[PDB]
Design a protein around this ligand. Sequence first.
Ligand SMILES: Cc1nn(C)cc1-c1nc2ncc(Cl)c(-c3cnn(Cc4cccc(C(=O)N(C)C)c4)c3)c2[nH]1
Length: 254
Amino acid sequence: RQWALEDFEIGRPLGKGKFGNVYLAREKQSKFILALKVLFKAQLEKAGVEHQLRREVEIQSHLRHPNILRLYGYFHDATRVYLILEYAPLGTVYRELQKLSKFDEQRTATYITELANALSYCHSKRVIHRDIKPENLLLGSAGELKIADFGWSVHAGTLDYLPPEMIEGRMHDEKVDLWSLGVLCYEFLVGKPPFEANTYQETYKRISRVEFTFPDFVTEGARDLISRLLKHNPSQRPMLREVLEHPWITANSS
Ligand SMILES: Cc1nn(C)cc1-c1nc2ncc(Cl)c(-c3cnn(Cc4cccc(C(=O)N(C)C)c4)c3)c2[nH]1
């Protein structure tokens, strides 16, 4: 059922990027609180990523999971294109990560579990999120994890979370999310991605050679899970099912 900008009351700016802007909004007749992401058609055409917005809508609208930010629908003004998303009251994991510096093993493995379930769901529907970052992770009213962005998501730039196979241009499958999950787990425990550098060029070879080191405070149980996930060879990477069954995850999930 088609919408309009006159059906909403726009509020606080939730986040701000170059693509567009995200605001808090409320539907006038139902008083429903939702996030209203605004996209401008002029840099949507200039970047020629009409596919992704079409794929973000097409994929995220039918995907339905407690750990996936729901897409309610969309519409477009004469000028810009407006997206109607679920509102996540407790904000991003990103800022939650820069305020706490790092996460403890319980909060970490809990996030990994919530992500695995959401990924085990997505994968069994032949969907690859590929772009798993903390900036795409939001928090629900109970503090649960919610995957948000699908603006690079398909069926089978910024490098820090991208696997060797993807950055070198090779054909990539649903195993690229297993790499991202490992990179994410690491960053949750340390506060910084395993392969971060000061240059795109250096980072590229950190990923390709798989060169990461553990600080001393990282437990052996975690070092094992991350090492299994960050294997250069996509076939050596565990299934999401054995990740859930991992001793460290099990002894430290909620
Ligand atoms: C933030 C925030 N604080 N509080 C109390 C609630 C929110 C919040 N609820 C949200 N619900 C849905 C969405 Cl799509 C968003 C949202 C908007 N931009 N973004 C992307 C983004 C990426 C990187 C940084 C930021 C940002 O502005 N901060 C402050 C972390 C944002 C996500 C949501 N953001």
